[PDB]
Amino acid sequence: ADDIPSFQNPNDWVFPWLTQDTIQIAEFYEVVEKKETAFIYQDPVTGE
Amino acid sequence: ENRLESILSRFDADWTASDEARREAKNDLFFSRVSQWDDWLSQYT
Amino acid sequence: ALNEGQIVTLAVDEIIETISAITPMAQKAKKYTPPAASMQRSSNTIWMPVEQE
Amino acid sequence: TLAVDEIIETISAITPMAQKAKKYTPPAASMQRSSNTIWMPVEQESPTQEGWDLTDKATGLLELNVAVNMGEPDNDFFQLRADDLRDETAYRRRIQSAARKLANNVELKVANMAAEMGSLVITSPDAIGTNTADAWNFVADAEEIMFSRELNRDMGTSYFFNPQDYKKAGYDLTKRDIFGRIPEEAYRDGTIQRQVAGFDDVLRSPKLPVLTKSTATGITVSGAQSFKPVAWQLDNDGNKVNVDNRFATVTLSATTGMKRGDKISFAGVKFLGQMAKNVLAQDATFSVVRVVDGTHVEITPKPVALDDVSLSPEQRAYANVNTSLADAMAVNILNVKDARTNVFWADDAIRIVSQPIPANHELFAGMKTTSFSIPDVGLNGIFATQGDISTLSGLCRIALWYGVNATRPEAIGVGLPGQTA
């Protein structure tokens, strides 16, 4: 928390009188489509 | 190669691509919510 | 040996950081954003009152 | 004043050489830092020693290279006035004509470079229409000089006639007093044949240059000279800088009357069998590329001597000329008379490097940049438009950044009929 972050401000010059005194950070979501190993078990109750 | 640089490049590309629509949408929100008089360049009177 | 081959130059792009400064006073100072574009004339200033005694 | 939209089309040009030339698009990101120059290796030739005891006779490895680069954009800048009506009537047709002219310019650059950096030179003492099958002999001389030198022709070969010599070949075919299949084709149409004397693509080209004669005479080599194959050499700072393999600066008595494009041949130097290193019966021909200073020139085939004792065995493995220059060897000029050049080559000898002009960047605001695909020649340029009211007009610019390169000047050739007098 001591290391205050910063990022591209989406609110350029809010114009009442004074700034919101805010802190900006970002969350980057990324989707990776890939083949991963799957295990074929046998269900002890029923079903292959 | 740098993860920071790759993320920043992607973000900057999208940010500069969506620049006009975002500006128009922000102007629409301000117009519909706060005030319809945007007069700060008119301060010469 | 005497392998008189081909010579290239490899400029790779992992930069070497050298500068890391801090701004402890500007962050503490409050920011203001008035909508007055006439201040370019430098004779147009904002007047604010002082607490009365 | 009655006026219509009907267009009286006036010109229709063909671009076979630019179409056939391979087009290269190396990465622009690397080319920006590499000063628009990229190096490619050359097929390696190995030496050979026979014997039993070979102590302290182990050679090294040497692989030479060439470099390809580009020139400057070939634009179509023009200003267009909004109020005028003859400009609104002509804007789009002007754009189309600009595309056609850019393609024509690319073809002209290809033809001139091929005819000016063509090492192999075939010459005739008279016109093509002199003796029967003289056009066939002209093509066969080129095919034989490519065969004897053992030049790689896997991609294919090509021969471009000029229209006059093509007509002469057709006339020779049709005056045969017989009509089989080739004579009937040459009668009904002007085409001689699609393949002649071993070439797999024989065409005619309206944009082949005319090689103006050289006034140079009485020139001899000044000082015995030796040219050594090498890949890199040390500069002033000790750094190794690469060396191009398709150039050699010779010192003559006086380079007066020489220009870029003349063909020379020293008295005594003979071609070699490249791979086998067998002395041929043909004089070695070189093309002067650049006339630097007043007593030096730059010839495109580097004359590596088989009999040079200052060459290491790996360097001598690349020898293409049976001897060196000996301070008095008279140089004979081959183009002693004007002639429109016929040009033959191997299909993998001329390439066209191309690069994009990234004017779509956010830097260039206020002007609109799009792409522009040139027809005929398969190239890309940019089409950029800006406005102005200081003159109440608009500027349109069609830019194209490319460069023709002759990677194997020893593969390209030049045919010169009627080099008498």
Swiss-Prot record, chain A:
It is found in: Virion. Belongs to the p22likevirus portal protein family. Homododecamer. Interacts with the terminase large subunit; this interaction allows the packaging of viral DNA. Interacts (via C-terminus) with the head-to-tail adapter protein gp4; this interaction participates in the head completion. Interacts with the scaffolding protein; this interaction initiates procapsid assembly, thereby ensuring incorporation of only one portal ring per capsid. Interacts with the capsid protein. Forms the portal vertex of the capsid. This portal plays critical roles in head assembly, genome packaging, neck/tail attachment, and genome ejection. Procapsid assembly may initiate with a nucleation complex composed of portal and scaffolding proteins. The portal protein multimerizes as a single ring-shaped homododecamer arranged around a central channel. Switches upon genome packaging from an asymmetrical conformation in the procapsid (PC-portal) to a symmetrical ring in the mature capsid (MV-portal). This change of conformation may serve as a signal for headful packaging. This is Portal protein. It comes from Salmonella phage P22 (Bacteriophage P22). The chain holds residues 195 to 242 of 725 of the full protein.
From Swiss-Prot, chain D:
It comes from the Viruses. The record marks D5 as: Essential for binding to the capsid assembly scaffolding protein. Residues 1-47 are annotated as: Binding to the capsid assembly scaffolding protein. Changing L234A: No effect on phage production. Keywords: Capsid protein, Late protein, T=7 icosahedral capsid protein, Virion. One of its GO terms (biological process) is viral procapsid maturation. GO terms for molecular function: identical protein binding. One of its GO terms (cellular component) is viral capsid. Changing W52 to N/V: Drastically decreases capsid stability. Pfam families: P22_CoatProtein. Changing E9A: Decreased phage growth. The record marks W52 as: Involved in capsid stabilization and maturation. It is found in: Virion. Changing D235A: Lethal. Complete loss of procapsids assembly. Residues 214-336 are annotated as: I domain. The insertion domain (I domain) plays an important role in the folding of the capsid protein by acting as an intramolecular chaperone. Self-assembles to form an icosahedral capsid with a T=7 symmetry. Interacts (via N-terminus) with the capsid assembly scaffolding protein (via C-terminus); capsid proteins and scaffolding proteins form building blocks that assemble to form the procapsid. Interacts with the portal protein. Belongs to the P22 phage major capsid protein family. This is Major capsid protein.
